[PDB]
């Protein structure tokens, strides 16, 4: 299902990439997207899939488009258009200068100072989850750790019941990795239906949770509205539930397959921070975009007003111009270049939280379960979309080689 090429699109620029079902998926999701960076592909291409849109394939263009909010607007950041149109999360669907006030608030909730406050729980949950797994010599890492670890920390931050997870998780998944089961507007509506009562409850009787803080915040000297709070929280959920979860699986899948990388972190712990950035570069997983506010010539390609462009945050760091031997994991790279957390005014607020969750996990897992591998004959399946994921990750290990702490 390729849409007919618009008249302004030169046929030499066509490359029919399906962000939702890329051809090389078997090889891995990063590898499947990396095809866009082969010598045969122009830097800026047009795909006829998903209704037709542009894709920037290079770190250079991605960074520029991100910096340029005057031309590339956040207003409609998701492909396909219907999804981008229904998308109304704050601060993500807004441009500066309006964005700024909303960002300052979300920052109060997810920011540095919150991490510093939650540090002991993160460490506590990580240790508890691992210890519980250790003696079993086998898990489903995605269901057993990747999911509960980050999610329970989020549920804690948000003051939401663990009971709600499954429901919330599903709706979130529909938004980033649509199934066909529900349209974006539908999913969005369901999420909002969930939240509305909660926001109401917390405007009345405020707590110390993230929702209470957002529901009663000030923006541009006045109180946030119910609709604004709902739009903020909807974003917080997607970030809390769907990002860190997916990243850990990719990282763990890699560690499971590379004994020498595990060893390196075991002996040279001082390398964990560097390694964490290198995994962020190598297993980058977000791809959203922007919308042209007007006709604009960019790197000699004529973009028309209303055109959408995918600016895959995932691709910057896989770009050979940015990182020599990009598909290779090297914890001792002199410079790890990526835009895994974005670039420009929308730079990820939760990055501090995400790095803490990653680093604790590496340190704590390796401490207790230094030697593990993928279950014999398990075929690991990746999934692509706005946020790419791993379907399941069966791990196996010998209990006898683990260490209780």
Ligand X SMILES: O=C1C[C@H]2CC[C@@H]1C2
Active-site choice (59, 350, 385, 389): 350
Contact flags string 77-96 toward ligand X, x per CB under 6 A: ------------x--x----
Active site residue 319: no
Number of residues that bind ligand HEM (CB under 6 A): 26
83 is an interface residue for ligand HEM by CB under 6 A: no
247 binds, among ligand HEM, ligand X, none (CB under 5 to 8 A by kind): ligand HEM
Q: Tokens representing 301?
A: 């390609």
By CB under 6 A, is residue 239 in contact with ligand X? yes
The rounded distance, in Å, linking the Cα atoms of 282 and 275 is 10
If binding is defined by CB under 6 A, does position 389 make contact with ligand HEM?
A: no
- 143 burial (CB, 10 Å; 0-12 / 13-18 / 19+) is exposed
348 marked as part of a ligand binding site: yes
In degrees and rounded to multiples of 5, residue 294 shows phi and psi of: -160, 175
Stretch that binds ligand HEM, among 10-18, 251-259, 300-308, 349-357 (CB under 6 A): 349-357
Q: Which residues pair with 14 in a beta bridge?
A: 46
Rank residues 192 and 370 by Cβ distance to ligand HEM and give the closer one. Answer: 192
Pick one of 76, 236, 276, 329: the residue that binds ligand HEM (CB under 6 A).
236
Please count the residues of this chain forming the interface with ligand X, following the rule CB under 6 A. 8
Contact code string over 273-302 relative to ligand HEM, x by CB under 6 A = -------------x-x--------------
Nearer to ligand X among residue 155 and residue 349 (C-beta): 349
CB 338 within 8 A of CB 314: no
Residue 116 tokens, joined:
């510093």
* Greatest CA separation for the chain: 65
Regarding 173 and contact with ligand X (CB under 6 A), the answer is no
From the list ligand HEM, ligand X, none, partner contacted by residue 386 (C-beta under 5 to 8 A by kind)? ligand X
Are 336 and 276 in contact by the 8 Å Cβ rule? The answer is no
Applying CB under 6 A, does 244 fall inside the site for ligand HEM?
yes
Tell me whether residue 347 or residue 405 sits nearer to ligand X (CB atom): 347
User: What are the backbone dihedrals phi and psi of residue 297, each rounded to the nearest 5 degrees, phi first?
Assistant: -100, 120
- Dig out the tokens for 332 from the structure: 């001792």
Under DSSP, is residue 309 helix (H, G, I), strand (E, B) or coil? strand
Residue 230 near ligand HEM by CB under 6 A: no
Q: Residue 149 phi/psi, 5° resolution?
A: -50, -65
Calpha distance 280→278 (Å, rounded): 5
Residue 155 within binding range of ligand X, rule CB under 6 A? no
Tell me if residue 144 is catalytic. no
Give the C-alpha separation, 311 to 10, whole Å: 20
Give residues with Cβ within 8 angstroms of 285, minimum separation 6: 29, 243, 246, 247, 250, 314, 340, 387, 388, 389
Q: Is 350 a catalytic site residue?
A: yes
346 counts as binding ligand HEM under rule CB under 6 A:
yes
Is position 242 annotated as part of the catalytic site?
A: yes
235 binds ligand HEM (CB under 6 A): yes
Scanning 87-111, the segments in alpha helix (DSSP H) are: 99-110
Is 213 one of the binding residues for ligand HEM (CB under 6 A)?
Answer: no
Rounded CA-CA distance 34/158 in Å is 36
Is-catalytic flag, 92? no
| 81, 100, 177, 271: the active-site residue | 177
Report the C-alpha gap between 310 and 286 in whole angstroms.
Answer: 11
Annotated binding site for heme: 348
Q: What residues are labeled active site?
A: 177, 242-243, 348-350
Binding interface with ligand HEM (CB under 6 A): 77, 91-92, 99, 103, 106, 110, 235-236, 239-240, 243-244, 247, 286, 288, 313, 340-342, 346, 348-350, 353-354
């Amino acid at each position: 299902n390729l849409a007919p090429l618009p008249p302004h699109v030169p046929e030499h620029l066509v490359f029919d990439f399906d962000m939702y079902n890329p051809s090389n998926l078997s090889a891995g999701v990063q590898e499947a997207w990396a095809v866009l960076q082969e010598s045969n592909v122009p830097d800026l291409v047009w795909t006829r899939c998903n209704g037709g849109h542009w894709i920037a394939t290079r770190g250079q263009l991605i960074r520029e488009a991100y910096e340029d909010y005057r031309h590339f607007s956040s207003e409609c950041p998701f492909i396909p258009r219907e999804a981008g149109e229904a998308y109304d999360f704050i601060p993500t669907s807004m441009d500066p200068p309006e964005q700024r006030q909303f960002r300052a608030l979300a920052n109060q909730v997810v920011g540095m100072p919150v991490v510093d406050k939650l540090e002991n729980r993160i460490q506590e949950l990580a240790c508890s989850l691992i210890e519980s797994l250790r003696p079993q010599g086998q898990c489903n890492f995605t269901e057993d750790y990747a999911e509960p670890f980050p999610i329970r920390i989020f549920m804690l931050l948000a003051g939401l019941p663990e009971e709600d997870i499954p429901h919330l998780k599903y709706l979130t998944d529909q938004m980033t990795r649509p199934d066909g089961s529900m349209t974006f507007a539908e999913a969005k509506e369901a999420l909002y239906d969930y939240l509305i009562p909660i926001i109401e409850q917390r405007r009345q009787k405020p707590g110390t949770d993230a929702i209470s803080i957002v529901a009663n915040g000030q923006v541009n000297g006045r109180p946030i509205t119910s609709d604004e709070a709902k739009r903020m929280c909807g974003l917080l959920l997607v970030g809390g539930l769907d990002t860190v979860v997916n990243f850990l699986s990719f990282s763990m899948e890699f560690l499971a397959k590379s004994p020498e990388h595990r060893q390196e972190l075991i002996e040279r712990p001082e390398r964990i921070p560097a390694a964490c950035e290198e995994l962020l570069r190598r297993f980058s997983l977000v791809a959203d975009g922007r919308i042209l506010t007007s006709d604009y010539e960019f790197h000699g390609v004529q973009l028309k007003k209303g055109d959408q462009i995918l600016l895959p945050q995932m691709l910057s760091g896989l770009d050979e111009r940015e990182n020599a031997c990009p598909m290779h994991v090297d914890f001792s790279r002199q410079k790890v270049s990526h835009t895994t957390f974005g670039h420009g005014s929308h730079l990820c607020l939760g990055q501090h939280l995400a790095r803490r969750e990653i680093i604790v996990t590496l340190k704590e897992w390796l401490t207790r379960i230094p030697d593990f591998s993928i279950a014999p004959g398990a075929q690991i399946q990746h999934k692509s979309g706005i946020v790419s994921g791993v379907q399941a990750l069966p791990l196996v290990w010998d209990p006898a080689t683990t260490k209780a702490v």
